[PDB]
Protein backbone atom coordinates (compact mmCIF):
# COMPACT_ATOMS: atom_id res chain seq x y z
CA UNK A 1 0.00 0.00 0.00
CA UNK A 2 1.06 3.57 -0.51
CA UNK A 3 -0.18 6.50 1.55
CA UNK A 4 -3.17 8.00 -0.13
CA UNK A 5 -5.59 10.69 0.93
CA UNK A 6 -8.96 11.88 -0.29
CA UNK A 7 -8.49 14.33 -3.14
CA UNK A 8 -5.07 12.88 -4.16
CA UNK A 9 -4.31 12.63 -7.85
CA UNK A 10 -3.52 9.09 -8.94
CA UNK A 11 -3.97 6.82 -11.96
CA UNK A 12 -5.80 3.53 -12.06
CA UNK A 13 -6.79 0.72 -14.37
CA UNK A 14 -10.41 1.11 -15.36
CA UNK A 15 -12.19 -2.24 -15.13
CA UNK A 16 -14.26 -1.48 -18.21
CA UNK A 17 -11.38 -1.57 -20.69
CA UNK A 18 -8.22 -2.53 -18.77
CA UNK A 19 -6.51 0.79 -19.59
CA UNK A 20 -4.86 3.29 -17.27
CA UNK A 21 -6.67 6.60 -16.66
CA UNK A 22 -5.93 9.67 -14.53
CA UNK A 23 -8.12 9.81 -11.43
CA UNK A 24 -8.83 11.65 -8.13
CA UNK A 25 -9.59 9.78 -4.88
CA UNK A 26 -13.17 10.56 -3.80
CA UNK A 27 -13.36 8.41 -0.65
CA UNK A 28 -11.29 5.81 1.16
CA UNK A 29 -12.55 2.86 3.24
CA UNK A 30 -9.56 2.06 5.34
CA UNK A 31 -11.13 -0.99 7.04
CA UNK A 32 -11.72 -2.70 3.68
CA UNK A 33 -8.60 -1.14 2.10
CA UNK A 34 -10.60 0.16 -0.80
CA UNK A 35 -11.34 3.55 -2.24
CA UNK A 36 -13.56 5.14 -4.86
CA UNK A 37 -11.78 7.03 -7.68
CA UNK A 38 -13.25 9.38 -10.21
CA UNK A 39 -11.68 9.19 -13.64
CA UNK A 40 -10.67 12.77 -14.41
CA UNK A 41 -12.58 14.16 -17.31
CA UNK A 42 -14.23 10.82 -17.97
CA UNK A 43 -17.28 11.36 -15.73
CA UNK A 44 -17.22 7.93 -14.16
CA UNK A 45 -16.17 6.39 -10.86
CA UNK A 46 -15.10 3.01 -9.62
CA UNK A 47 -14.08 1.19 -6.44
CA UNK A 48 -10.42 0.27 -6.40
CA UNK A 49 -8.27 -1.57 -3.91
CA UNK A 50 -5.86 0.96 -2.45
CA UNK A 51 -3.03 -1.51 -3.36
CA UNK A 52 -3.95 -1.18 -7.06
CA UNK A 53 -3.61 2.65 -7.34
CA UNK A 54 -0.80 3.96 -9.48
CA UNK A 55 1.38 7.04 -9.60
CA UNK A 56 -0.40 9.98 -11.22
CA UNK A 57 2.53 10.04 -13.72
CA UNK A 58 1.20 6.82 -15.37
CA UNK A 59 -1.14 7.66 -18.17
Amino acid sequence: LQQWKVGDKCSAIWSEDGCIYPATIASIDFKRETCVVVYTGYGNREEQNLSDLLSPICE
Side-chain angles (χ1 to χ4, degrees), residues 37-58:
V37 308
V38 175
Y39 295 109
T40 296
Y42 298 93
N44 265 118
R45 76 180 67 193
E46 156 153 89
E47 187 151 274
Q48 291 280 339
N49 298 317
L50 289 164
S51 53
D52 290 337
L53 294 181
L54 312 165
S55 176
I57 298 169
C58 315

Side-chain angles (χ1 to χ4, degrees), residues 2-59:
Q2 315 197 274
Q3 292 161 335
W4 291 107
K5 65 209 173 73
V6 174
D8 270 344
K9 293 175 177 233
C10 65
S11 292
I13 305 167
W14 199 339
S15 65
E16 125 218 298
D17 73 352
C19 291
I20 293 170
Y21 287 91
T24 304
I25 301 169
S27 64
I28 300 166
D29 180 342
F30 280 114
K31 249 145 207 138
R32 303 204 186 267
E33 300 288 22
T34 62
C35 61
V36 172
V37 308
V38 175
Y39 295 109
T40 296
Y42 298 93
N44 265 118
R45 76 180 67 193
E46 156 153 89
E47 187 151 274
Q48 291 280 339
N49 298 317
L50 289 164
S51 53
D52 290 337
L53 294 181
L54 312 165
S55 176
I57 298 169
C58 315
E59 283 180 292

